[PDB]
Design a protein around this nucleic acid. Structure first.
Ligand SMILES: Nc1ccc(CCCNc2ncnc3c2ncn3[C@@H]2O[C@H](CO)[C@@H](O)[C@H]2O)cc1
Ligand SMILES: [K+]
Ligand SMILES: [K+]
Length: 546
DNA sequence: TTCAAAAAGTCCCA
DNA sequence: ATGGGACTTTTTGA
């Protein structure tokens, strides 16, 4: 449970918080890491501090106690008054204490401000000038329930339904930062856009001045770790300035060690830089450049409806154990199941633009099985193979669901109708019209048009514009970037997409119908579809004035 | 009763 | 062995 931050990032963070420190004015800075681990950040802080003190040793000796300020006394001073670390791992603290002791190589048995504790529970007796480090990331599934009760009761300003632990670490760091202090940390990027991060974003916006956001997007910073990172730097300084420097990466395939320093990478063509006014932040943080801001605002102003206005959205089936209820359509065991119980089953990869692949799987809609005696063959020879796993589901332990029932079988009538489907995680917009009453898991989302908006919007028109290049860019501006070439397509953002209706409605609809007709051929002339899409994109750009 | 969010993702191969 | 690519379950709070 210990993660090594790359040295280039560690150096950038420490330098970010200490480059302009006035050691003459304040020779007693407090630099804290509340998840210090083996001291990836703190040892570097020691190096920076030692150079800072030794470069001004004679100035300090003249302004202050001349006997206290010598080179020989630097190592002691740093440990007594400057470096502070906290971590839950005892072995890590022991190792870091030995490393800090070996920075000099007893005289008086120097005390080192290292605490082996839960930083979210520690009674912190004073605030700190500088806070750096890499907090732990633990999500809603992997966090202990008993501990989650404490977080919900005590960190309710940032920790709620599906929040993450590092939300609480952000709140703690902000709370124990001195007036005029500086904090710089590396966390997941997901709180910048996620629905769970709304309270955290409000807290950060309204309690600190955000200096800088480095967004690495899908680039893999931590080797062999599936997480997407960002660096946040904030302060509590009295300033009328309220502008943020945003560095957003341009090529996610870059390796982090191209130059000797991260700042060389940030100044290069690998990153784009722009400024965001913190006072103009809403509940969402729309961090885009002026071209994209103009693009987004044009679209928002022009469109008079949203998908939420005109549609009904729902998440797919959650069986609770897929292997028990999902079978290949050529499985011999499917001869045991009456066709009234069987539904077509698709995965996210089966969703293309405008149409769905033919399904290869069948769902046993076991909610329609009455009792265990009439269909004993289905239960004993198909579903019962996983009975233990099925009995451990939450709604079975509580007794709400029978052991063979789907955990969340939703409502059949919602699926057995003409509707639009899209994958929950994709590199591009893929909205299809489903004609075959397809069921799917939560990896696919569905919506259908309300009855009162059918005369205004058709499924063909909607899949026309939603699959356009304009709308790919428009959705990705505010979407949640998960990993390299993966965006979240969830209703909490998909339903916010704004749509329009003007003189180009009929031609866009006709082009969409032609695309759908071609895609459903035996001899698919795939080429002409691209030409038709280009023409449709021209129509949409004409419609939205871009 | 029953919705929808959640990557320190998961798994595989060259 | 690692780094990169294809693909995506069900646990969980509200
Ligand atoms: N059972 C159990 C339940 C909940 C928790 C959460 C406790 C949160 N409070 C914590 N307080 C201090 N340090 C913590 C910490 N959680 C993780 N670390 C350290 O962060 C580094 C980055 O990974 C590593 O060196 C971890 O050892 C911990 C255990
Ligand atoms: K003096
Ligand atoms: K990543």
């Amino acid at each position: 449970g210990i993660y090594y931050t790359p040295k280039i990032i560690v150096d950038y963070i420490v330098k970010k918080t200490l480059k302009n420190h006035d050691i003459i004015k304040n020779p007693y800075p407090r630099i804290l890491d509340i998840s210090c681990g083996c001291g990836n950040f703190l040892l570097e802080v020691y190096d920076i501090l030692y150079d800072l003190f030794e470069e001004n040793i004679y100035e300090l000796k003249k302004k202050y106690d001349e006997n206290y300020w010598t080179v020989d006394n630097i190592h002691r001073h740093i440990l007594n008054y400057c470096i502070y670390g906290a971590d839950i791992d005892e072995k890590a603290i022991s190792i870091l204490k030995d490393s800090l002791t070996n920075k000099k190589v007893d005289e008086s048995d120097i005390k080192i401000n290292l605490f082996c504790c839960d930083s979210l529970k520690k009674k912190w007796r004073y605030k700190f000038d500088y806070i750096v480090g890499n907090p732990p990331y633990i999500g809603h599934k992997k966090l202990e329930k008993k501990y989650k009760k404490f977080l919900l009761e005590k960190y309710s300003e940032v920790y709620k339904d599906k929040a993450d632990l590092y939300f609480c670490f952000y709140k703690k760091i902000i709370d124990i930062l001195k007036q005029g202090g500086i904090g710089s940390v590396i966390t997941p990027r997901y709180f910048l856009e996620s629905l769970s991060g709304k309270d955290l974003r409000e807290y950060i916006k309204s309690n600190v001045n955000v200096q800088e956001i480095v967004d690495f997007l899908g680039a893999n910073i931590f080797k062999n770790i599936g997480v997407s990172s960002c660096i946040l730097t904030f302060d509590k300084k009295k300033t009328k300035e309220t502008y943020i420097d945003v560095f957003k990466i341009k090529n996610e395939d870059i390796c982090i060690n191209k130059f000797e320093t991260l700042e060389e990478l940030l100044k290069s063509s690998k990153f784009e830089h722009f400024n965001i006014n913190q006072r103009l932040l809403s509940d969402e943080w729309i961090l885009v450049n002026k071209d994209d801001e103009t693009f987004y605002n044009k679209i928002q102003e022009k469109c008079k409806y949203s998908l939420e206005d005109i549609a009904i959205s729902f998440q797919g089936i959650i069986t609770g154990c897929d292997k028990a209820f999902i079978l290949s359509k050529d499985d011999v065991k499917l001869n045991l199941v009456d066709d009234k119980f069987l539904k077509c089953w698709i995965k996210s990869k089966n969703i293309n633009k405008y149409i769905v692949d033919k399904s290869e799987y069948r769902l046993i809609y076991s909610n329609d099985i009455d009792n265990e005696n009439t269909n004993k063959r289905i239960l004993d020879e198909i579903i019962g193979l996983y009975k233990t796993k099925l009995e451990n589901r939450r709604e079975c332990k509580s007794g709400i669901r029978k052991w063979y029932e789907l955990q969340w079988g939703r409502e059949k009538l919602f699926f057995e109708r003409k509707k639009i489907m899209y994958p929950y995680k994709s590199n591009e917009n893929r909205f299809a019209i489903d004609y075959d009453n397809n069921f799917s898991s939560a990896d696919v989302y569905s919506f259908f048009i309300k009855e009162e908006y059918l005369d205004k919007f058709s499924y063909e028109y909607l899949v026309g514009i939603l699959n356009s290049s304009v709308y790919d860019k428009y959705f990705k501006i505010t979407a949640k970037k998960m990993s390299k070439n993966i965006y979240d397509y969830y209703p909490n953002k998909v339903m916010k997409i704004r749509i329009f209706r003007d003189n180009n409605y009929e031609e866009i609809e006709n082009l969409s119908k032609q695309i759908i007709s071609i895609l459903l051929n035996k001899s698919i002339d795939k080429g002409k579809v691209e030409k038709l899409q280009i023409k449709m994109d021209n129509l949409i750009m004409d419609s939205l004035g871009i």
